[PDB]
Design a protein around this ligand. Sequence first.
Ligand SMILES: NC(=O)C1=CN([C@@H]2O[C@H](COP(=O)(O)OP(=O)(O)OC[C@H]3O[C@@H](n4cnc5c(N)ncnc54)[C@H](OP(=O)(O)O)[C@@H]3O)[C@@H](O)[C@H]2O)C=CC1
Ligand SMILES: C[C@H]1CCc2nc(N)nc(N)c2C1
Ligand SMILES: [Ca+2]
Ligand SMILES: [Ca+2]
Ligand SMILES: [Ca+2]
Ligand SMILES: [Ca+2]
Ligand SMILES: [Ca+2]
Ligand SMILES: [Ca+2]
Ligand SMILES: [Ca+2]
Ligand SMILES: [Ca+2]
Ligand SMILES: [Ca+2]
Ligand SMILES: [Ca+2]
Ligand SMILES: [Ca+2]
Ligand SMILES: [Ca+2]
Ligand SMILES: [Ca+2]
Ligand SMILES: [Ca+2]
Ligand SMILES: [Ca+2]
Ligand SMILES: [Ca+2]
Ligand SMILES: [Ca+2]
Ligand SMILES: [Cl-]
Ligand SMILES: [Cl-]
Ligand SMILES: [Cl-]
Length: 159
Amino acid sequence: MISLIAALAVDRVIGMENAMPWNLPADLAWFKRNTLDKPVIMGRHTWESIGRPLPGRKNIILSSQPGTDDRVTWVKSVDEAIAACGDVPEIMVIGGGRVYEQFLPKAQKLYLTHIDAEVEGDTHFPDYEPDDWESVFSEFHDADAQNSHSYCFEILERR
Ligand SMILES: NC(=O)C1=CN([C@@H]2O[C@H](COP(=O)(O)OP(=O)(O)OC[C@H]3O[C@@H](n4cnc5c(N)ncnc54)[C@H](OP(=O)(O)O)[C@@H]3O)[C@@H](O)[C@H]2O)C=CC1
Ligand SMILES: C[C@H]1CCc2nc(N)nc(N)c2C1
Ligand SMILES: [Ca+2]
Ligand SMILES: [Ca+2]
Ligand SMILES: [Ca+2]
Ligand SMILES: [Ca+2]
Ligand SMILES: [Ca+2]
Ligand SMILES: [Ca+2]
Ligand SMILES: [Ca+2]
Ligand SMILES: [Ca+2]
Ligand SMILES: [Ca+2]
Ligand SMILES: [Ca+2]
Ligand SMILES: [Ca+2]
Ligand SMILES: [Ca+2]
Ligand SMILES: [Ca+2]
Ligand SMILES: [Ca+2]
Ligand SMILES: [Ca+2]
Ligand SMILES: [Ca+2]
Ligand SMILES: [Ca+2]
Ligand SMILES: [Cl-]
Ligand SMILES: [Cl-]
Ligand SMILES: [Cl-]
C-alpha cells in the first residue's frame, strides 16, 4: 500500500526555492503522526532540504546517481524504491513534486493538508483526477496563535 502525503496551498503549490513557505506547525504534527514507523520515500531535493534522516522511519532517497550518505537507503528507480521497503502495511511518499508525479498512478491513498495560503511557487502537487479519489476523512481547522492559516486534513482513497 503506497500512499502520498503532501501539504498544498492555493493552486496546489507545494514549494518555492526548496522551502515550504508557510508557518503551520499543525501540519508538522499531522505529518509526524501519519508517517512515524513507516518507510518514507523522497527525492534527492527533498532529502537535501531536511539535512538529517527522519527518526523512527526507514529513509529511502531517489537519485539517478550513487548515494552520498550511508545513514539512508539510496535507490535509482520507483520500482527499486518500493522493493527497498519490503512487505510493510504502508509506504509513505513524502515528496517532492517530481517524486509525487511518478508515484501518483501507483498510490492507493493521499493524505492532503489543504492550506488557505496565497503562495508564489516553483513546485506543484500533480493534477489528480477528482473522479478517481474518494474523501474518507476531511477535518477543517481555523487559524490560531500558532497556525497562520486555516487548513483541512484530508484522506482520499483510490475508488
Ligand atoms: N509541501 C509539501 O508537502 C512538500 C514540498 N516539498 C517541496 O518540493 C520541492 C522539491 O521537489 P522537486 O524539486 O520536484 O524535487 P524532488 O525532491 O522530487 O527530487 C528530485 C530528484 O529526485 C531524483 N529522482 C526523482 N525521480 C527519480 C527516479 N524515478 N529515478 C531516480 N531518481 C529520481 C532525481 O535526483 P538526481 O537528480 O540525483 O537523479 C531528481 O533530481 C521543494 O520546494 C520542497 O520544499 C517537498 C516535500 C513536501
Ligand atoms: C519534510 C516534510 C515536512 C512537512 C510535510 N507535511 C506534509 N503534510 N507532507 C509532507 N510530505 C511533508 C514533508
Ligand atoms: Ca496557479
Ligand atoms: Ca524571492
Ligand atoms: Ca521550509
Ligand atoms: Ca522541504
Ligand atoms: Ca529542518
Ligand atoms: Ca541520523
Ligand atoms: Ca530530519
Ligand atoms: Ca545527481
Ligand atoms: Ca514493497
Ligand atoms: Ca512526472
Ligand atoms: Ca484558500
Ligand atoms: Ca490565509
Ligand atoms: Ca515545477
Ligand atoms: Ca487537482
Ligand atoms: Ca469530475
Ligand atoms: Ca474543509
Ligand atoms: Ca473509495
Ligand atoms: Cl521528527
Ligand atoms: Cl487565506
Ligand atoms: Cl487563512
